[PDB]
């Protein structure tokens, strides 16, 4: 069989998980089963990490000297290595805080890690079993009550493995006792606890029990608010999916911020590379989740919404105002941030760094001094010094941070502009009044009416994902350079050279690439060789994305037609291949745009990961 084209692959694989179009498992029970399978995959991935850490790793040597040992991820057995590279490499080092997490949550041996891997595999088996039997009964599982109960149970675990649990007198048997007895496992000290330079395990356990109880109460309050005023007027998998994705993106970005500034894993701030990778990774995940929330909002508009006088109807009626005002905000922010950066570039270039426009971030400084800082650092708003201050890793801002935050605002507002514009024009524009009948994603409407390239709602996400990556790159450059200056004790090279963008080149990118490029050269290769190779690979992927984005189909379709002609006219092969089976055709326009975006972002992520590793190694 198989008398289709290669277009069939990229047509179905783009909707292979669009289960709403899959009439077989279209019921919500099947979607919950997909969630169970995904959680089984997550459990097996965590089992992978724990198994390779406990198998070939130094966790037993890590708990003894967490500052003087480098965590090992897995053993390297690449056959392509040369004996020297084999002698050179010990094992694949660790770029994630799993050693720190295991140390925090009470792991003290490789036997405990092995039992954890077995438990993760068994839990993945349980998830697969649950996915085997989709059922309205299983739809009962879940809810904010369930996640709050999970938080309470995690609090119980952390109490059981808090460092002070040994001094804890059994509360459930000998009564609550004195307050210090509970303080052995439940504290609210606040901020870094010194030593481990992270939040106390007692703080985390107390946090989790409080969060679980409050979540139970909030869920009960929300359900009684559903008792009276019971209105599920708009139910859609995409509406709820957008809600979940936006909340998850907010939570993940907040996780990045508050895990850098309030690390909860012992001896984490001493490991610079893992901290930077944590922040960058979680910020990328949060931005992706927010973008997905916007995308699924657009999809809900496309194929699940019915016009009414509701919240969404009001948003749609004045969509011109929303788009115009967002465009004004983006134009103002971009104009001014770019102009101030160019002015600083000109002043620094012309040997007159004093004449730069350095607008002091007085509002954020006011917030920091009045609400956060316990000592007079800037002196504006307040100058009181705290008698008993608490510790954390909140950076001290300066003039460059104003421009960087305005760049961040420009990026966020432009991304929101593209996403909102596409979602609200999914209902139709004057160039495409009937977009409600064309689906979320389509190539174009042809060359007529002046041209309709990238007019689809999916193309709005395609355009906005470049802006997502650009905004995350901007503020991750900000975070990475800030923490590099703090760790290298410069803190003045940043505060002066971040005002102009040539500083962002010379002192950040060109400066921090010196060791990465020396991963392998004529002299030899060191442990950074893999990351220089990945740097090059990511650049190659990025430029292949350039190929798929710049050059469009028709050319490539004609070229592939000529290649098919060569094959059909070739000897020894026209007897075997008649091009009828899986006919080679050029990628469709939507498929090409998505694949170009995928290469672009893959090169983006891998390039920045390699750079972060080579800079903070």
């Amino acid at each position: 069989y198989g008398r289709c084209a290669t277009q069939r692959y990229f047509q179905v694989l783009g909707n292979i998980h669009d289960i709403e179009l899959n009439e077989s498992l279209n019921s919500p029970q099947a979607i919950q089963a997909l969630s169970f399978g995904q959680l089984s995959v997550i459990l097996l991935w965590l089992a992978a990490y724990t198994f390779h850490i406990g198998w070939s790793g130094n966790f037993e040597a890590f708990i003894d000297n967490p500052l003087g040992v480098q965590p090992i991820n897995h053993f390297v057995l690449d056959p392509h290595y040369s004996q020297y590279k084999v002698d050179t490499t010990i094992a694949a080092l660790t770029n994630h805080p799993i050693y720190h997490w295991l140390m925090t949550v009470g792991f003290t041996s490789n036997a405990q890690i092995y039992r954890f891997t077995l438990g993760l595999e068994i839990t993945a088996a349980v998830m697969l079993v649950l996915s085997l039997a989709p059922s309205v009964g299983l739809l009962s599982m879940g809810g904010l009550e369930v996640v709050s109960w999970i938080s309470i149970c995690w609090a119980g675990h952390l109490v059981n493995f808090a460092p002070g649990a040994a001094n804890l007198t059994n509360v459930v048997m000998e009564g609550p006792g004195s307050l210090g007895n509970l303080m052995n496992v439940l504290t609210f000290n606040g901020g870094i606890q010194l030593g481990t330079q992270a939040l106390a395990v007692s703080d985390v356990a107390h946090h989790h029990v409080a969060i679980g109880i409050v979540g139970l109460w909030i869920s009960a309050l929300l359900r009684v608010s559903k008792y009276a005023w019971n209105f599920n007027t708009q139910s859609s998998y995409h509406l709820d999916l957008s809600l979940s994705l936006t909340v998850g993106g907010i939570l993940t970005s907040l996780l990045a911020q508050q895990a850098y500034v309030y690390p909860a894993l012992s001896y984490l701030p001493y490991d610079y590379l893992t901290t930077t990778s944590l922040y960058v990774h979680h910020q990328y995940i949060g931005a992706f989740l927010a973008t997905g929330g916007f995308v699924h909002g657009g999809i809900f508009l496309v194929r699940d919404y019915t016009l009414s006088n509701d919240l969404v109807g009001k948003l749609l009626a004045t969509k011109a105002t929303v788009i115009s005002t967002l465009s004004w905000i983006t134009l103002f922010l971009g104009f001014h941030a770019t102009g101030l950066y160019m002015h600083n570039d000109a002043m620094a270039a012309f040997g007159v760094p004093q004449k730069q426009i350095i607008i002091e971030p007085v509002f954020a400084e006011f917030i920091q001094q009045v609400f956060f800082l316990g000592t007079p650092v800037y002196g504006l708003g307040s100058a009181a010094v705290s008698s008993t201050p608490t510790l954390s890793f909140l950076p001290i801002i300066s003039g460059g941070d104003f421009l960087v935050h305005h760049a961040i605002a420009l990026g966020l507002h432009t991304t929101v502009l593209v996403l909102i514009k596409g979602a609200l024009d999914s209902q139709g524009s004057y160039l495409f009044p009937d977009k409600q009948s064309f689906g979320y994603g389509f190539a174009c409407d042809g060359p007529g009416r002046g041209g309709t390239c990238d007019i689809s709602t999916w193309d709005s996400f395609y355009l906005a994902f470049f802006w997502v990556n650009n905004t995350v790159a901007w503020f991750t450059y900000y975070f990475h350079w800030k923490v590099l200056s703090l760790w290298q004790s410069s803190t003045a090279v940043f505060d002066e050279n971040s005002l102009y963008l040539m500083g962002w080149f010379r002192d950040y990118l060109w400066q921090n690439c010196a060791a990465l490029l020396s991963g392998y050269d004529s002299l030899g290769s060191n442990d950074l060789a893999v990351w220089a190779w990945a740097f090059l690979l990511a650049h190659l992927a990025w430029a292949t994305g350039f190929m798929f984005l710049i050059s469009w189909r028709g050319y490539w379709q004609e070229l592939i037609d000529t290649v098919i002609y060569m094959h059909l006219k070739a000897p020894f092969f026209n007897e075997i291949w008649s091009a009828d089976v899986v006919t080679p055709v050029a990628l469709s326009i939507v498929q090409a745009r998505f694949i170009g975006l995928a290469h672009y972002v893959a090169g983006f992520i891998l390039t920045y990961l390699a750079f972060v590793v080579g800079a903070t190694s």
Partner: protein, 89 residues
Amino acid sequence: ERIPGGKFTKAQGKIVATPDEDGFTDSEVALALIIAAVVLYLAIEVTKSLFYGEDPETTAKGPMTPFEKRVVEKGLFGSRGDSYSPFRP
């Protein structure tokens, strides 16, 4: 022995201490592989179930459990709707 690359590895002087023994022996690795084989069998079952979809007779010939009956009747746990929403309330 490794050739250190990166300013912070040299500056902080962190040493990659290889454990003297392995850590998981060989028997426990075999047990992990066996459990992963069972998980793989379950995954094959799940893949077969999902690829062919849900048959039409089940959820139509199998009577709903009294829990499911009362939940659908009263509209609970995502019923009375067309969404999944694991974080419902």
